[PDB]
Structures are given as structure tokens and as C-alpha cells.
Design a protein around this ligand. Sequence first.
Ligand SMILES: *[C@@H]1O[C@H](CO)[C@@H](O)[C@H](O)[C@H]1NC(C)=O
Ligand SMILES: *[C@@H]1O[C@H](CO)[C@@H](O)[C@H](O)[C@H]1NC(C)=O
Ligand SMILES: *[C@@H]1O[C@H](CO)[C@@H](O)[C@H](O)[C@H]1NC(C)=O
Ligand SMILES: *[C@@H]1O[C@H](CO)[C@@H](O)[C@H](O)[C@H]1NC(C)=O
Ligand SMILES: *[C@@H]1O[C@H](CO)[C@@H](O)[C@H](O)[C@H]1NC(C)=O
Ligand SMILES: *[C@@H]1O[C@H](CO)[C@@H](O)[C@H](O)[C@H]1NC(C)=O
Ligand SMILES: *[C@@H]1O[C@H](CO)[C@@H](O)[C@H](O)[C@H]1NC(C)=O
Ligand SMILES: *[C@@H]1O[C@H](CO)[C@@H](O)[C@H](O)[C@H]1NC(C)=O
Ligand SMILES: *[C@@H]1O[C@H](CO)[C@@H](O)[C@H](O)[C@H]1NC(C)=O
Ligand SMILES: *[C@@H]1O[C@H](CO)[C@@H](O)[C@H](O)[C@H]1NC(C)=O
Ligand SMILES: *[C@@H]1O[C@H](CO)[C@@H](O)[C@H](O)[C@H]1NC(C)=O
Ligand SMILES: *[C@@H]1O[C@H](CO)[C@@H](O)[C@H](O)[C@H]1NC(C)=O
Lengths: 148, 194, 189, 49, 30, 339, 148
Amino acid sequence: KPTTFMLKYDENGTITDAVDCSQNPLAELKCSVKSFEIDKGIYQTSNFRVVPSGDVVRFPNITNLCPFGEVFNATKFPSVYAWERKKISNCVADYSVLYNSTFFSTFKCYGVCATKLNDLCFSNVYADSFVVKGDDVRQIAPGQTGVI
Amino acid sequence: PFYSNVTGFHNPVIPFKDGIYFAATEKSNVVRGWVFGSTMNNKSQSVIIINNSTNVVIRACNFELCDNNAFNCTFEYISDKHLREFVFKNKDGFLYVYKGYQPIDVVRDLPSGFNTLKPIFKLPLGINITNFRAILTAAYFVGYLKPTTFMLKYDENGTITDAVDCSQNPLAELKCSVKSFEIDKGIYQTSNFR
Amino acid sequence: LNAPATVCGPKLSTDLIKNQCVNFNFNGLTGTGVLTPSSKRFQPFQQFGRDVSDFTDSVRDPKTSEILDISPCSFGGVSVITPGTNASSEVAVLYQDVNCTDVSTAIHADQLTPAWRIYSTGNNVFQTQAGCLIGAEHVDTSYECDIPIGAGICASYHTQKSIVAYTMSLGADSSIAYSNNTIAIPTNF
Amino acid sequence: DVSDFTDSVRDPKTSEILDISPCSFGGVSVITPGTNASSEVAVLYQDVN
Amino acid sequence: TQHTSSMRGVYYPDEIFRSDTLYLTQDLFL
Amino acid sequence: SISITTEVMPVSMAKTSVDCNMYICGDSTECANLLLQYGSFCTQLNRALSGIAAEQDRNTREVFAQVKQMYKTPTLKYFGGFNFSQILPDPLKPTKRSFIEDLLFNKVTLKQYGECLGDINARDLICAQKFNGLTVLPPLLTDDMIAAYTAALVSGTATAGWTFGAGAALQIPFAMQMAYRFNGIGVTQNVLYENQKQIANQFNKAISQIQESLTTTSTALGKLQDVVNQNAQALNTLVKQLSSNFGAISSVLNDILSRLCKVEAEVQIDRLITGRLQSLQTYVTQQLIRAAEIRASANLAATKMSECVLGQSKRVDFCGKGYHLMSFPQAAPHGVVFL
Amino acid sequence: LSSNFGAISSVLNDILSRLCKVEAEVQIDRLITGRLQSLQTYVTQQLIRAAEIRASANLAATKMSECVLGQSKRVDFCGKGYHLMSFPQAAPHGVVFLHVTYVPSQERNFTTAPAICHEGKAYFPREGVFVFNGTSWFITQRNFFSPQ
Ligand SMILES: *[C@@H]1O[C@H](CO)[C@@H](O)[C@H](O)[C@H]1NC(C)=O
Ligand SMILES: *[C@@H]1O[C@H](CO)[C@@H](O)[C@H](O)[C@H]1NC(C)=O
Ligand SMILES: *[C@@H]1O[C@H](CO)[C@@H](O)[C@H](O)[C@H]1NC(C)=O
Ligand SMILES: *[C@@H]1O[C@H](CO)[C@@H](O)[C@H](O)[C@H]1NC(C)=O
Ligand SMILES: *[C@@H]1O[C@H](CO)[C@@H](O)[C@H](O)[C@H]1NC(C)=O
Ligand SMILES: *[C@@H]1O[C@H](CO)[C@@H](O)[C@H](O)[C@H]1NC(C)=O
Ligand SMILES: *[C@@H]1O[C@H](CO)[C@@H](O)[C@H](O)[C@H]1NC(C)=O
Ligand SMILES: *[C@@H]1O[C@H](CO)[C@@H](O)[C@H](O)[C@H]1NC(C)=O
Ligand SMILES: *[C@@H]1O[C@H](CO)[C@@H](O)[C@H](O)[C@H]1NC(C)=O
Ligand SMILES: *[C@@H]1O[C@H](CO)[C@@H](O)[C@H](O)[C@H]1NC(C)=O
Ligand SMILES: *[C@@H]1O[C@H](CO)[C@@H](O)[C@H](O)[C@H]1NC(C)=O
Ligand SMILES: *[C@@H]1O[C@H](CO)[C@@H](O)[C@H](O)[C@H]1NC(C)=O
């Protein structure tokens, strides 16, 4: 088993004695003071915790899925000077269809890691859609410069 | 800010600097609605927030504006004396509205007292607001908001009952520095001057 | 979470457990603690309550709109009381600032982190203000203090010997009576 | 050693154990009578042969 | 049947000489 | 004239402890594995706080436990016309203290400390904890034990005089003891024996004036208040520093662990760990420096108890303004009041 | 010196021998910060302990001045009882004082008076108290019974 031991080497370098350090409170005391003999007294050795005994998951009453397909696979996209805002709310979102495909050239998330997006929940999501030049996609980032 | 100068009106194009505190002392619901354009023409986007007698309608389009049609709409929302007070603020493409209410009697004037305002709604409409105007069918007051530090007192139930503005007096800054409403006698270092 | 949550991932909600140390997940707010009914009066735009050290201490249930208090699962220091190895190999254990039922049920259910393989609680469980003392027997006589435990409670190794815990004595008791016409004078040195 | 220093080694050719010790180091102190008195000094090399 | 392992199954943890110390180690032990 | 003067001395401060992992890491295991890379930080810090906590009980024991005998309080508290009732316990009173001690305990005014206080006799003992991991430990000697010590000291002074500090107690009438102390200050015995009623009346009026000055809302016990305030101030700082992010994206570990993946999360947790280590180290250093000053004050209180309560002193202004005759101790929150 | 403080190793020679100079300088900076923290902590604790040793040495010097070179009247400054004389002995990093004291013993009860009245005049003792065996009135000193 994975345990901690304390070994006692002799002046000639062989192990002559040891203590198993999780057998007793006295053994943990001997580990803490690093000695085989203890004087009388009271000694602080460690800290105790109580292990959790259950699991509570609590999420709202949401049943509908929400239109990622009707945002991405859309026929008409507007200009970059006149972009459009769409609100996604009251849905169960998957997010695996975004990072499970090689369809996107640029996929960069600010503030979050991608695979963590499936466990945590939001209030509502806002989507902005436009068509931009080839070399201007690096200007769509916080703290950038350019005409866009 | 505390004990600041507010303008009373007893409908000009009033500016909208960094958000406003709007108050109205009404008896027959005369002031109902606002408009938050930029140039107050059809060449700029503008939002109207007006209620008709049951329903609150908010609409953001290119509008012709009258005094004394509508195209290219982007946002629409419809939902179903005494003093009514509102706070309007606009940042990061969001328009925040706060609202409170209070029973006063009459004098001619904005009364002295303390009252707290709860959030109602924030709208995701991405425009400049540099002007506003009330929509009338009896007085209303306008004050302006500034970036300040306040100290608020939550009671045993969770309601804000008192506050100090930390930029009014040296004593108020002392109260904000020691985090108390009562000060003993002495001399205290509060800040540095440049 | 500026508003009540509406866009969540696919997860299976379970029933809630009270008066028990559990892992919890409320709308992506994860943690470990014990949940109790609360008397706080939330306002309808408020979703949870916060401490001065940015700890969430109350939460609104997102199925029934019930306010629950969150408290930490119990923790603390462990002290070992020994009479010296040359005297005996018996020890007593003090769990500092904790209820005795909370540690006794955790020991019997195998839910403490310093888990000792060969260790028995026994029937010598005794509650002090310093914490819970296990392995020392309470007696009613008073002695001078040998090993201080706290709040007037001391421990020693007395009588087939055993470790005993008692209330300390302040000193020898004596009464000399005030009389107004007598004196006491030493006759030797 | 206790501070993860190697204090002995085994020779990879002759299989002989060799102890390793640090080269001698320490502090240097200068003893002067004062500048207005003289310009001669004495030097103490601390804890060395 | 079942018996007890009275202080059995200790091995040298690594290939390092040590002398006249007490060494704490954490590994897979009996 | 006979005058009575008050001196207030701090003896001990509050004993505190911290769960180092619960303060720095909470319940995370990644944070614990990262904090393992700094060696023995939490162990020596618990060692320093434990040394301070033991030192406080040593201070209290050195100041108060100076008698080897527990002298019972006399039934009659009128010795030669001198009225000792306000400095001795009242049998027909629920508390086991004096009137002046009750006033002193009412005068000194004392959350999120994480301690647990209550009544063990009525089963009204509650232990509730906090997520920050801070705790205040109880003193070894209870307040009733200290009150019993001061009662034994005052009873020995009223019954046996000065002899019990230097040997066995020897009984003597109070007027003869007071005549001997008058001889000590250089005045003859007939000055007391012929003016005994006047001296007793002045003693009684000064005792009455002390318990009025200690009622009319003075600030004489501010030295005991400051200590309390200092503790609270320091400990409050240690809580508020848990709200700083130290350059990380947040000050809460659960958010960083729940919306970030491992490589960036380790960097953010390292930024949090460094600042929390610095805060806790600063707290421990300032607690050691305050403990040294409390120790010096308790040493002075012990020598004043030894030389002014168990004897008559010739050192000028060491205890009182005037020629010293006798002195009485009273217990106060975290300290001692000499009269 | 055995901690790595986030670096790859706690020995500088391995870092300098298996890594190139820029990354090696990063790891050396990680080691340097922790070792300065350790040394600073040690020096602060030593200064705080030196203050306490200095206070103890001041108390030892005033005891040597007032109890070995003289006789003191301060109660319990040198031993328990009435101080007569005191001898110093040297100890490793310290001093041991041997105090010689006079302890009264074997007390007796007497009847006492403040004054006596010979012929319309009051008489007070110069040095001692008036006592009564069972037959006659005498005068004694307070610390040893010797009737006169
Ligand atoms: C090594 O040292 C031990 C300690 O006394 C001794 O008993 C033993 O004989 C030594 N080994 C040899 C080979 O001499
Ligand atoms: C409003 O502000 C201006 C400039 O600070 C000030 O001069 C004026 O007096 C204020 N209004 C009133 C009514 O005092
Ligand atoms: C006026 O209210 C009615 C319902 O009361 C609503 O249908 C209508 O849209 C409102 N008018 C405007 C201009 O929104
Ligand atoms: C509405 O907006 C579009 C571009 O967003 C613009 O081309 C058009 O001219 C606008 N409508 C009118 C009537 O000007
Ligand atoms: C909280 O609300 C209750 C319910 O009316 C009220 O009795 C109590 O006074 C309130 N608390 C405060 C501090 O006003
Ligand atoms: C959620 O669903 C449960 C049962 O399905 C129901 O009791 C509860 O009222 C619902 N809550 C909301 C806010 O719809
Ligand atoms: C006084 O005590 C000593 C021993 O302590 C004894 O030898 C001596 O006889 C005693 N004196 C008298 C008068 O009893
Ligand atoms: C210094 O070293 C020399 C040569 O090794 C030796 O003879 C001498 O005794 C040493 N000095 C000491 C040990 O003081
Ligand atoms: C002593 O003082 C108390 C309180 O002042 C008083 O009640 C009592 O009668 C006094 N004793 C006397 C006058 O004998
Ligand atoms: C321990 O728990 C029981 C049951 O909840 C309670 O009655 C008792 O007061 C608790 N004791 C302490 C010291 O918290
Ligand atoms: C005589 O001395 C004894 C010894 O303590 C004491 O009990 C007794 O009270 C004394 N006699 C008188 C009359 O006080
Ligand atoms: C008191 O003194 C007288 C005279 O010296 C002596 O005769 C008598 O015996 C003494 N009393 C006692 C009890 O010894």
C-alpha cells in the first residue's frame, strides 16, 4: 500500500529499524518529532478533515435545445460595419459540435478553456456575426489596432 | 453625489453625459416615456422606451422625431402626489435602468430624504446616447452621475439604509477610511495630497 | 450569472441532502460543505450571498427557490498526549474545537482524513471546551496540573495505571481566623 | 547529505570510495588602529589552518 | 487461514548510501 | 490624607491559530501539491503560533499564582473600622467576583474569528467554523480561577499581613499591622492609634470614590482596550487579504479550477499562493513582535505583585504617589488592576 | 536547500549542466527567490530571539549587582524568605545564583495589646510588640521570640 515509513540507518549503512507512520497516533508523533523516544507532554501533529459523503447537482428546468445550426449555417451574413446581435437563452447547449470538427480555421477562447465549457452554466449567450477580410481576422481580439 | 445641483423643469433636448438620475412628481401620470437618440434624426439609430397605459414597449430603429416613418429596426421588446425616480446608465453596449418609488405629498420641489433603487432591466443595444428627451402627454428633475466611491450600510435584513459619499468632506473621507459612522476624538491620517 | 441561469450544459440533477458533508454544484458553483435551511430574506433579483473574504455562504435553490446556508465540513488540529515512551506506550487524542458526535460518527463511518489502521475510539469520549478528548478517563478528584489541556482541564498518568483527565486545583486550602487581640510569633528559624 | 549534497562517490574504474569535502572558504576581517594613527593593518582569516 | 505480518517486508528504497540518520520516505510498503 | 490610586496593567493577549492549508488552498488538491514545493512553511508557522499561545498562559501563571495557600474569605469584612466589602466576594450574589471586579469586567468591550465559545454546564456549547481557517483558543485558567486567586490574596492581606509572602502566614490585628506600616514610612505608632477613626473614614471614602470614578464612563482601562483592538485589527487584515487576486484572473480557487485547463491554472494558482504566503508570514512576524511587549508588561506586573502586595516598598513612585502603605489586586479582562 | 520552489530540481549543477542558458536562468531565478525568503526569515527570527536574551542578561546583571554585592530589601527578588547573602556560579551560556535565606518557623499564639497604661499615661513600644504568656506582659521583636 502507498504509505510513509521512517527508516533508521546505523553507523554502518544498513536499515536496522523502522516505524510505519500511519499505524497509530504514537507512530505519527514519532514521525512528527523525528525520534524513537518521546518525552511527556502534548504535541500538535496534524490536521483532521471530514470526507464528503454525497453529491448534489442542481440545475434549472431546461428542456429545449438551442439553435447553433441556425446561427452558423445561415445563408446571409451582414457587413462588418453593420453587425447583428442574437440572443441565445433558455436552452441546453452541447458545445462539442464546435471543437469536435475541423471546420473552423480560428477557434480562440478568452477567459475559458474549451473543454471546460460543457460543465458550467451561464445566464444567456450573445452571438455576433459578420464577414471580414482575410488578414483582418487577427484584429478581432482584445486590445488590437487597425481600421476594423 | 450628495447635495449636488439638479435642474428642475416645470421639453428641451437634454444632454446625457454619463448616465442620469431622473425624478418626477406626478398626480395624473403626465411624464411617460423617453427617447435616447444621438442626433435625434433618421440618420442615426434611436431607442424609445414608452408605456401606453398597460404595456411597456421598447424599440430601437431609425426614427423621425416630432416636437411641440420608422425603418431599419434592430431591437424590440414588449411587456405587460407621488415621486417616481429612475437611474439610466450605458456601458459596454448595455443600457441599465434602475427604478424606485416614493410617496410624497406636495411642496413644489424635490424633497429631502433617502431612498434606494432596484434593478429592472438591461438592454443589449449598442449605440451612443448623447441626448435624451422626455415624452409628455407636475414637474421633473434631472441630475447627473459621476464616478465616485460610496460606503453602504446593509442592515440585519439586507436593505441599504444609509450611505456616505467619500468625496464630500474631510470627515466623510475619514469615515470611509476607518469604516465607521462614529469617530472618537483625535487626529487621523487619511490620505496624501499631490 | 448576472440573472437566473438559462443556458446550461447537459447534466443530470440529483436530490439535495441536508445536514451532511457533500460535494455540491449549484448552477456551476461547485464546492464542499454542509447545507442547512436558512432564515435569510432574499430579494427576487438576488441569487446568492457572499462573505467579506469572497466566500459564498448562502444560495437560492434553482428548482424550488429555497435559500440554503453553506457551512464548512469540520476540520481542526490533532494533539497527542503521552506520558513519555519510557513510562508507557498509551496515548490520548484531542481533536481541537469540534463536536464529539461529529468526529465519533466520522470515525465509525471511516470518514476522517488521518485514518489510523489500528485505532479504537472506545467508550472514553469526553467533551471539553478545547475540543473532544478520546482515550482519557474523567475523574472527580483534583490534583496539580501535569499536562495542560485547557479551560481548567488538565491530564496526567495515575492509578494498573491509565491516563486521567481532571479539573485542576489551585492550591492547598487553609483557614486562619481573624481575631482582634492575638498575635502569632515565630520561635525558631 | 541531508541537504541533497553528495559527500562520497564510488570510482567507476577502481571501485574505490572517495569522500568529497569543500575547498576551504570563510570570512576576512581587517584590524586597523585608525587612519590618522597609521596605515598598517592586520588580517584575520576566520576558521582556517 | 490468515496470519499477521509483524514488521516484515522492508526494502532499500534507492541506490544511495546513508549512515546514522533517520530517513522519511513515501512509497509502496507492506 | 489617605489616598487610593488605580494602576492598570495588561498581562496576556488572545491565543490564535490558523489551518495553513485551509487558509491558502481550501479543499483543493492541485493547490496542495503546488504548496508542497515550498518545503516546510506551514509546520514552522504552526510552531511559532503554538509558542506564543503557550507563552500567554505562562504569563498569567507568573502574575497570579503567587500564593501557595487558598485562604478562605472571612465572614466579617470590617476590621478595626476598615470596610473591605467592595474588594471581597459577596456570598449572596450569583457571580463569584467582587463589586469592583464586576465594574471592571463591564467596562471593557470586546466576528469571523472562527472560535467557539459557550457554556458547558448548561449544554449551551456551540462550535461553528469558517472557511478561512482561523481559530481563537481558550485560556488555561478560567476567570473564576483568577478571581479566586485575587480573593485569596486580599484575604491573606486582611488577615495575616505581610508575612505569608516570605514564609508561613502569621495572624495579626489590622490596626497593629497598619501601625507597623506607619512605622515603615517613618511616622510613629501613636499617630495612628490616636487618629484611628479618622484614618478608617478616609480609607472608606477613597474606596467609595474609586467605584464612582469607575462608573462615570471614564477611559482609564484603555490600555486593556487597545490590546483587544490590536488583535482584532490584525486578524481582520488577514481575512481581507483573501479577496486579493495578486495578478491572477480571480481571487477564488474554484473558478480558476472550473473554467481553466491545467497549464494556465497552475500559473494562476502559483500567483495566488505566493501572495497568501506573504500575508500569513507578515501576520506571524507582527504577532511575535507584539508578544515580546506583552511579555515585558507581564513581567512588570509580576514584580509589582511581589513587592507591593506581599510587602511594603521603599522605591519612589514604584506603586502609588506618596508613601506606600499597602496594595490590593483586582482581576480585569486580560490584565490586573492594582489599588 | 532541498526544496525546488517550482523549478525542475534543487541542485544548481544539474540545471546548469542539462539546460541551455535562458531556461537555466529562469530556473535559477526560481531557486534564488526561495533561498532569499528562507535566509530573511531566519535572520528575522534570530533578531527577535536576541532581544529576549538581552533582556534576560540585563536582569542577571541587576541580580548580580544587588544580591551578590549587597543585601536587598525587595520582596522575592532573590529567593524566598529574608535574603542574607548570595553566591554566583557559572553555567554554559548562563549564571546560577545560590541565595541564602532566613525562614521563620514554629510560631506561637500570644495575647497582645497596642499600649499599656501605667499612671494616666500611655506607653508604646519602640521596637516590637507587647505579648502575654499567661502571667506577665513582655515585649518582643516580631521575627523571633525573645521576651524582655
Ligand atoms: C557496523 O556498526 C555496528 C554498530 O556497532 C557494528 O555492530 C557492526 O559490527 C559494524 N559492522 C562491521 C562489519 O563491523
Ligand atoms: C452647479 O454647479 C456649478 C459649478 O460647480 C455651481 O457654480 C453652481 O452653484 C451649482 N448649482 C447650484 C444651484 O448651486
Ligand atoms: C398599446 O397597448 C396595446 C395593448 O394595450 C399594445 O398592443 C400596443 O402595441 C401598444 N402600442 C404601441 C405603440 O406599442
Ligand atoms: C438601412 O441600413 C442599410 C445598411 O444597414 C442601409 O444600406 C439602408 O440605406 C438603410 N435604410 C435606409 C432607408 O436608408
Ligand atoms: C426585518 O424584517 C422583520 C419583519 O418585519 C422586522 O421585524 C425586523 O425589524 C426587520 N429588521 C430590521 C433591522 O429592521
Ligand atoms: C422545476 O421542476 C420541478 C419539478 O419538475 C417543479 O417542482 C418546480 O416548480 C420547477 N421550477 C421552476 C422554476 O419551473
Ligand atoms: C530549632 O530547630 C532546630 C532544627 O531545625 C533544632 O535543632 C532546635 O533545637 C530548635 N530550637 C528549639 C528552641 O526548639
Ligand atoms: C594545521 O595544519 C598542519 C599541517 O596539516 C598541522 O601540522 C597543524 O597542527 C594544523 N594546526 C592546527 C591543527 O591547529
Ligand atoms: C461597607 O460598605 C458597604 C458598601 O458601601 C456598605 O453597604 C456596608 O454597610 C459597609 N459596612 C459597614 C458600614 O459596616
Ligand atoms: C453537537 O451536536 C449535537 C447534535 O447536533 C448538539 O446537540 C450539540 O449541542 C453539539 N455540541 C457542540 C459542542 O457543538
Ligand atoms: C492558636 O493557634 C492555632 C494554630 O493555628 C489557631 O488555630 C488558633 O485559632 C489560635 N488561637 C487563637 C485564640 O486564635
Ligand atoms: C512567661 O514568662 C514567665 C517569666 O519568664 C515564665 O515564668 C512563664 O513560665 C512564661 N510562660 C510560659 C507559658 O512559659
